[PDB]
Design a protein around this ligand. Structure first.
Ligand SMILES: Nc1nc(=O)c2c([nH]1)NC[C@@H](CNc1ccc(C(=O)N[C@@H](CCC(=O)O)C(=O)O)cc1)N2C=O
Ligand SMILES: Cc1cn([C@H]2C[C@H](O)[C@@H](COP(=O)(O)OP(=O)(O)O)O2)c(=O)[nH]c1=O
Ligand SMILES: Cc1cn([C@H]2C[C@H](O)[C@@H](COP(=O)(O)OP(=O)(O)O)O2)c(=O)[nH]c1=O
Ligand SMILES: [Cl-]
Ligand code: NA
Ligand code: NA
Ligand code: NA
Ligand code: NA
Ligand code: NA
Ligand code: NA
Lengths: 399, 398
């Protein structure tokens, strides 16, 4: 007889709700969605789309205020909840910082920008204020020095998901503890603190700070940082210290732009992801290696979720797959419909008739049991297309 | 031995002064910052001190040619060519714990950002800005109650001592250098704060806004304002208004209460002026009721007069004892270097009542101190022919 209202967006809303349906089938779910959920799966899943496809009713916040016997759980939700319009106090939020620091907006950027080594996710009570209610559970997150705003956000989504799952029973059974947030070190950033319509690198800063600007503004689906309108994908601190005014362009080549700072010169790497992606169809690793300035560009994706590893698999480019995996690519990487590397590779196998590299991919960790967001395995697609012969081949190599 | 002092303000004066007393064989050349007006304000003019002490004033171009000098920058404002000197004895005092807080407004940014500490750094002048290898640092604890002005004064004081503590090593190539790290480096330009258009930001937490107050509280430049009304500090309240941050919840003659992102804040209206006036004649019981922030007791008017000075001038000894027990400086000075003892001396002359001198002495009054014309209180008594008071005060000297 319990009820829960899940209000928000992206993979956190989707995977928390999924868990509920799998492990809490018993509980009635109502969903609230954000204003800019279009019902189309982008780099994050559409929660609106998920709810419609699963017959989970979508309600408004107005209506949510009047359900007395429900828990309310907000996950990247875009609406100011007014707690007094509820007739209960079981209102919970996952905020993407280690509160009491970084209340408010852009928590994937500000910690990077300010030079933080760590951040966190915090489950808390909702009160009238913004990210101010009492803390229930938290988890510290390491921000690696290579990681971008995008990587950080994806960690938020992932850890935020687990924290909810590790606590949701206590929320449902009213078995949780709370602690008021401290005054000291409390910080907050409004939407006005960064103007993503007019984003600008500031070279009157240290190299350290400037590399953190790049990192903090590297979130491809929104933007990359620019210099003279040229997109940049990361950069490094050089050993030289130019006499010239900070902001002064020291060199341009095909791959990079070097710039004067307050202290050390920085090299900014021109974004060539699109060129790299094209090249991953047929080129060997030797050729890709020379294209690469920052190693992490190998794990970037275009607006459909296609990565270098995914493109490599689609064209059977097995020596490149191996290399990409050795550099840290995910052998089970997915695009934004959940289509896996193994599914792309199956297309290559059908087209070429060369099945011989499957065994080696399986040894790299390739997982044939995974399902896309229609809940199909590669096996279901083969059976549907009537390729029984390739189906049994693939079956025999899985583990 | 020989030294070029390039810079401005009290630290440059203090180090130069110290050198003329404790190392009278050293030759000194100065460079002054262009915008030194030659006139003392709440900071002393280095240019003025140099002209009055016949210290030669030279330019960067000249400094490059003096091969047997060390070059000491005490907030010098010009980029130098390090390698153009024929030596590498090139030093700078910077008012931060480097590599953090490179650049400008180092009395503000650390407080704004919620730091508990800062410091001063003696380092090499090298390529970059504020980036040369570290020679010696002093950590400074920034107390929760301390303003920009309090921190600036610690910088002056501690930087001066940093220099003095290390001056032999500087003159004799006997220091140890450690190149700075890059990690946690920060820098702020002069564009990062616009002091001609300061606005408090209330879309912030209580902690941040109190730290804004502190950071912007530097009376001789400005105080923070709400409704064009000046504020001297404030406090966090345990209540939490539903009203948009920045909404005024209450006002009276003492204070203004405002909504924040989290905890309501009380902003205390600046009543220093009222306090200073009252110090002429009120006792501590009355004064204590005017105070909303203890440290307003140590502010100064445009001449440099504090409560303890006004009290001494008026022979208000009961209040001096109290002020001192609150942390005041019994030897405070105005912007001419006129000490508390000099003001009290005037009171003794006007009153003919000398008996309170022992009480101030026991509170720590120092009569040997000198003003910026270099006179003690005894010298002024001499010049004025007040031989009786001079004899009375002299009786106290061991
Ligand atoms: N070569 C050299 N390096 C130094 O680090 C140094 C010297 N000389 N000489 C003395 C002092 C000078 N430090 C500075 C610091 C900032 C500006 C300056 O013009 N800053 C501007 C604008 C530049 C920008 O932001 O790009 C500002 O932001 O306020 C000038 C001199 N200094 C100490 O070691
Ligand atoms: C709106 C926006 C966000 N971002 C980054 C910073 C944010 O932390 C991150 C997620 O932003 P967003 O998708 O707005 O989610 P949330 O509002 O829940 O933080 O995306 C950009 O890089 N550019 C943008 O224009
Ligand atoms: C110029 C200025 C400085 N300050 C503070 C910030 C600084 O760290 C501190 C000392 O500055 P100061 O050494 O006077 O810097 P400047 O070269 O600009 O004179 O005073 C103000 O509060 N208001 C102001 O208008
Ligand atoms: Cl198929
Ligand atoms: Na209610
Ligand atoms: Na914005
Ligand atoms: Na530079
Ligand atoms: Na001259
Ligand atoms: Na300014
Ligand atoms: Na409030």
């Amino acid at each position: 007889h319990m009820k829960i209202i899940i209000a928000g967006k992206n993979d956190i809303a989707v995977n928390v709700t999924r868990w509920l349906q799998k492990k809490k089938k018993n509980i009635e779910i109502y969903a609230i969605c954000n204003a800019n959920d279009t019902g189309i799966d982008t780099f994050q899943r559409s929660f609106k789309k998920y709810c419609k496809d699963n017959l989970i009713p979508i309600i408004s916040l107005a209506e949510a205020y009047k359900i007395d016997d429900a828990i309310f759980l907000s996950l990247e939700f875009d609406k100011i909840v007014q707690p007094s319009k509820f007739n209960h106090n079981e209102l919970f939020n996952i905020h993407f910082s280690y509160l009491p620091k970084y209340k408010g907006m852009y928590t994937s950027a500000w910690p990077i920008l300010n030079g933080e080594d760590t951040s966190g996710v915090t489950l808390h009570k909702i009160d009238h204020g913004i990210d101010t209610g009492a803390i229930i559970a938290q988890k510290e997150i390491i921000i690696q020095p290579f990681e971008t705003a995008k990587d950080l956000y994806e960690k938020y989504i992932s850890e935020g998901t687990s924290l909810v799952i590790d606590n949701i029973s206590t929320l449902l059974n009213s078995e949780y503890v709370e602690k008021e947030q401290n005054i000291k070190y409390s910080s907050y950033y409004s939407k006005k603190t960064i103007d993503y319509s007019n984003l600008e690198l500031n070279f009157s800063k240290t190299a350290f700070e400037i590399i953190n600007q790049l990192r903090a503004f590297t979130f491809r689906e929104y933007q990359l940082p620019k210099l003279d309108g040229v997109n940049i994908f990361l950069g490094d601190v050089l050993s030289s210290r130019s006499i010239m005014k900070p902001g002064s362009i020291l060199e341009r080549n095909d791959k990079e732009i070097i710039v004067s700072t307050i202290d050390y010169d920085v090299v900014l790497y021109k974004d060539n992801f699109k060129e790299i992606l094209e090249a991953c169809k047929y080129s060997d690793s030797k050729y890709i290696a020379k294209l690469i300035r920052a190693k992490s560009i190998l794990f970037e994706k275009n607006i459909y979720g296609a990565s270098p590893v995914i493109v490599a698999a689609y064209h059977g480019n097995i020596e490149l797959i191996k290399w990409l995996v050795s550099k840290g690519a995910n052998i089970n990487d997915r695009n934004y419909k959940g289509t896996t590397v193994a599914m792309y590779f199956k297309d290559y196998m059908l087209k070429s008739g060369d099945y011989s590299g499957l065994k080696m991919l399986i040894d790299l960790g390739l997982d044939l049991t995974l399902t896309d967001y229609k809940d199909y395995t590669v096996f279901d697609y083969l059976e549907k297309s009537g390729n029984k012969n390739l189906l049994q081949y693939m079956m025999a190599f899985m583990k």
